[PDB]
Design an enzyme around this catalytic site. Structure first.
Site, PDB file in Angstrom:
ATOM      1  CG  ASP A  77      -1.939   1.002   1.321  1.00 10.40           C
ATOM      2  OD1 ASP A  77      -1.800   2.101   0.759  1.00 10.40           O
ATOM      3  OD2 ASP A  77      -2.958   0.675   1.986  1.00 10.40           O
ATOM      4  CE1 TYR A 115      -5.368  -0.096  11.888  1.00 12.46           C
ATOM      5  CE2 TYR A 115      -5.106  -2.366  11.179  1.00 12.46           C
ATOM      6  CZ  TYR A 115      -5.629  -1.103  10.986  1.00 12.46           C
ATOM      7  OH  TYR A 115      -6.382  -0.798   9.869  1.00 12.46           O
ATOM      8  CE  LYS A 124      -7.855  -3.052   7.040  1.00  9.93           C
ATOM      9  NZ  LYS A 124      -8.291  -1.699   7.501  1.00  9.93           N
TER      10      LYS A 124
END
Ligand SMILES: [Mg+2]
Ligand SMILES: [Mg+2]
Ligand SMILES: [Mg+2]
Ligand SMILES: [Mg+2]
Ligand SMILES: [Mg+2]
Ligand SMILES: [Mg+2]
Ligand SMILES: [Mg+2]
Ligand SMILES: [Mg+2]
Ligand SMILES: [Mg+2]
Ligand SMILES: [Mg+2]
Ligand SMILES: [Mg+2]
Ligand SMILES: [Mg+2]
Lengths: 356, 356, 356, 356
Positions: free
Chosen positions: C11, C228, C231
């Site tokens: 990403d 985090y 994903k």
């Protein structure tokens, strides 16, 4: 002078698996409660079952955690278990973990929800009893009933309810509780109760006057036994009307059949299916989890009712959705999130060649 | 000292076609079994029907293939058939192929599933009885119950079941059987049982201790008579819990209404519809095939129960899907794969100008 | 002489949120790969996206974990991220965790699945790329493709496949792997891979000849970053035909849209939705999770194709079910099991008055 | 130094009824904005339509309620209306209520939503434009996006959002506004915004830092004209990410197609249908009401995008439900609650023999 409503329940064995309470075992429990009522220990009672859990609903004037009321329940369970054993029922005496009784049933296996109250101008209540799940199954419904204005429009329109409700949240792992008030603390509340295996709503109070509005059974067999011996199968009492949720707002909170932990082997999520008394039995995959709701009015210690709340066409689509979701969940087999998360599987036998 | 559970069944005639057993014929069978129970030949019994098949469920201490138990069943069928004939029922005495009895019922027309066992600490069982199909209809469900970890998560999570189960597979054409063990031999197992007209699971055992877990009736009328005289209409007994499938895992295996051979004129595939006792009758196109499931506990030879297993809302979508699939199949008319394959049609009258 | 198929993805920023890769960033990556192809570093490539993840599919003869191939991918990502930053895209350079490259991309943020193989008589493959989930999302599909005879009937009927497949299962928490062979070890296999956040299938091999059949990207951002940051968004390469699953058996394993972890804020379970290239973008609740499948043939290092596998009416009901399940899950709000289990929430900010 | 995002819209006539903007009228508006951009009045723009409403999305550095930006929009509308009149379009110049412009467009007919902001590290936004309804149609979605933890789990899990949001609620009848903060004042908030014809959310701010998060157009034609002359057809700008709702949380708030006032003759409730650009036109019963959502990133006054947000399969069931609800509503004919309540019908011609 107060009236106590006590719901004490236990699995004392069942027919063909963890499926249904056998009527002869209920008749045995009935004899004990009939005697207690004749003696004036309790004022009234109603006996029923949900799935394999035998339910004793009693009214009396002896307060919460009363030794004699609890011992009456224990004896009723013991007589029921003796009949279960004589009938060769599966898991005879399942939830009777202690050989003997002392003090009260908490920690002995049976679940209990009870509230000592002053009866209101009228005292309508709903009692909810579930099979194949655990107490945290009531977290989402209680949040909706008492805090969500999309569930309970009384919070918005009814001046008596505008002040909101507060929640006694038990950390069942650490044995400590916190009070959180809605609507101010709802984000904190949800951060906890969104993990229902750990943080369980135990009681709800109205903020304005600290009126006790709901109580949930918080016995957890995993934590009592140190291993999986069954699903806790919880009960809850909710007081209704008069600036507490209307019957219809309590029922609205169960119109969505949410996923709850338990079901087969205490190891799965499945949808909570609200059912009539006749449908309160566990079948496909030992469920889906079943919810029985009974409405009563309490009058000078008398139980007027019950009315079977979910035995009504307004819940037919809720049941259909539960069936569709059960099938969808089941196609996952032994994978999360149908199978439980590791921290809760750790109580099963699951724990029982890797190279760097 | 062992207890034998025997299910012996037969079609002795029915009302309005192959539709339902008439109650007067069951009352006749009852008189015979009542006498046998009074005499101590059998310890207990339950009589019912699925569709046009009269079911004798008996417990006794006389072992498998006992002449006296089988002769008691034969006599009960004969008395029931006499009433059927007096009532002018359709196909009076249908499955009573022999004029007289000798040895046991196998090869005389009636179907039998029986197991001599040592009753466990508790002995929950499920008995499944089907109308309008054949024994191989239980192949897919038994595979799922005992070998598929997406059906029976006990295989994965329950240390007592991890060792798996083995299957006695009968080649009904050649009269020879093979034992195949799961999970090691599942691909070989499926290569056979995927042809249910030929290879039928007859018994299932637990690998660890060779405990007998399930038995299926393997009488096949086509092969007994040398032509089509009806659907075999098979029965199966499954022991539950204690390291065998839970009731819910047995029921999970019937939650999908699979296509089974039989239905109209013994010549079609249709979906197996799990039904309540009241719905255990054949209607549209002489079906769809019907499955009745009864749960019992066995206690010192006593039958406690039954509970009607599929009479429950958790199977309402299974029945709806069966109805939708029945309609879809029916739009095929007399074409395969709604009509049976040629090797199985060869037993019908179908066999009864080509130019190079 | 072997051909390596490398899928490296990252990403590098997206339009309007975590929604879609902007075309100008793909054109930047293309310039880099075009140069690498001209120089003979790689033999062929295809660039695409799924959601906000930019996909580099490359064939070359430089083996697995090749520094130059990985550095080419890194540079393509850096050029794409520069364009993302110039365009003010959201999360420009998201997955580029290191300021600089060394050795290979593993541990730097990008995900990689690659296999060095000998091209077969023909070499059909499918490449699966997912957005809004993690590598364990492929556990259930790979189990089905390679071990479940209800998915892949080749296991039963095809003599070349009867010997089964074995799975390299990585414990991603402990960094150790185990090999488990089907069908003998399926119950052990499922006991692990049923917890997909911890135990991930990394590779699959055919038992008979140890042929490498599938590889999954096992980079996990949570475990790389210690918190985090997104994903992982995993990719997998599956070789097809010739005694490996047929294209249709690989696709069968995605016909059920199972619940996978990720979706909004990396904190929820939602159904995996197989989609066309045009539909490979994240919308409602930042999903549902999206799966793109591309079929190719590899010929002397040339990529013939792609064909967009799920852009076809045979997956229209799969998408509809995913939509229905997404709505059902969403009605749970911030409650488990829609919200992730605590051990996986611990990487979010969730962790950031109790009385005995 | 700030960037202003201005969305100014107006109905200047349409083809075949109140159905769709004609492309030639958009080309006329484009010429005006092209000139303004060349002159440096605005930095960038995007022109589109939803139904019969022509949309001017402009970025510039001239602040909110800038006379020159508003006059540029007015001139673009006037040129578009001239083309509409030359084409004989229906309702040419519909929303241009004044013959001439002064000050700004507010009160002249066009709707406006604009925010002057400091561009964040990245600046993703969503712009929502609706046809056949009024500004209060955004009340329920904005409540969900910014206050409902079942919509926006960031409120629960994201420490940056835990402090909540506050709402500027305009009483459009009295022309006074109040600020109410969530979650503390949600019951009061809902008591107002539950009446969307009167109380409209105009802006939303983050509590912690008073960051401006959303703005809604609050022009209401009924109240400007003193009678019904059309539906207001409102627009809203929502800033995303970085401790504001994620794109997916904004979109979640439109996944339920709620009933909104407007539709045929400005006199009915119908479901809000989220649609692609190609489907942004009014058909059955002059609707149902249509919602177009465009995602952009703003970068130094540049508009990067748009991405068409609802043109995606995750909203296919939302559209299907809208269709089913539209049919259900329509079976009510001219009865409340399909027809509007009397206080809002009073602006139509409806007002235009009783005996004691
Ligand atoms: Mg039990
Ligand atoms: Mg129970
Ligand atoms: Mg229990
Ligand atoms: Mg018959
Ligand atoms: Mg029959
Ligand atoms: Mg028959
Ligand atoms: Mg991203
Ligand atoms: Mg992604
Ligand atoms: Mg990612
Ligand atoms: Mg118009
Ligand atoms: Mg309009
Ligand atoms: Mg208008």
């Amino acid at each position: 002078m107060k009236t106590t409503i006590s719901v004490i329940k236990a699995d004392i064995g069942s027919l063909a698996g963890h499926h249904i309470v056998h009527p002869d075992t209920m008749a045995a429990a009935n004899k004990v409660l009939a005697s207690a009522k004749e003696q004036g220990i309790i004022l009234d009672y109603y006996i029923t079952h949900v799935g394999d859990d035998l339910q004793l609903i009693m009214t009396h004037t002896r307060g919460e955690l009363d030794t004699k009321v609890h011992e009456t329940a224990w004896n009723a369970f013991k007589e029921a278990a003796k009949v279960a054993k004589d009938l060769g029922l599966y898991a005879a005496g399942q939830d009777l973990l202690s050989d003997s009784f002392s003090g009260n049933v908490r920690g002995l296996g049976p679940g209990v929800a009870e509230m000592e109250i002053e009866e209101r101008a009228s005292e309508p209540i709903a009692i909810f009893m579930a099979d194949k799940t655990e107490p945290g199954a009531y977290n989402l419904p209680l949040y909706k009933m008492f805090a969500d204005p999309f569930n309970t429009p009384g919070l918005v329109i009814d001046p008596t309810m505008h002040g909101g409700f507060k929640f006694e949240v038990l950390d069942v792992y650490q044995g400590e509780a916190v009070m959180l008030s809605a609507p101010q603390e709802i984000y904190d509340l949800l951060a906890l109760i969104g993990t229902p295996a750990r943080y369980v709503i135990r009681r709800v109070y109205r903020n304005e006057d600290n009126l006790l509005a709901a109580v949930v059974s918080i016995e957890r067999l995993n934590l009592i036994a140190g291993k999986y011996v069954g699903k806790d199968d919880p009960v809850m009492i909710v007081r209704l009307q008069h600036g507490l949720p209307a019957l219809g707002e309590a029922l609205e909170a169960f119109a969505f059949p949410h996923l709850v932990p338990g079901w087969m082997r205490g190891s799965h999520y499945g949808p909570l299916m609200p059912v009539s008394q006749r449908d309160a039995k566990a079948t496909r995959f030992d469920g889906p989890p079943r919810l029985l709701g009974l409405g009563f009015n309490v009058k000078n210690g008398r139980l007027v009712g019950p009315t079977d709340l979910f035995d009504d066409p307004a819940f037919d689509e809720t049941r259909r959705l539960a069936n569709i979701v059960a099938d969808y969940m089941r196609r996952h087999g032994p994978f999360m999130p149908h199978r439980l998360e590791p921290t809760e599987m750790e109580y099963t036998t699951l724990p029982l060649r890797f190279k760097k």
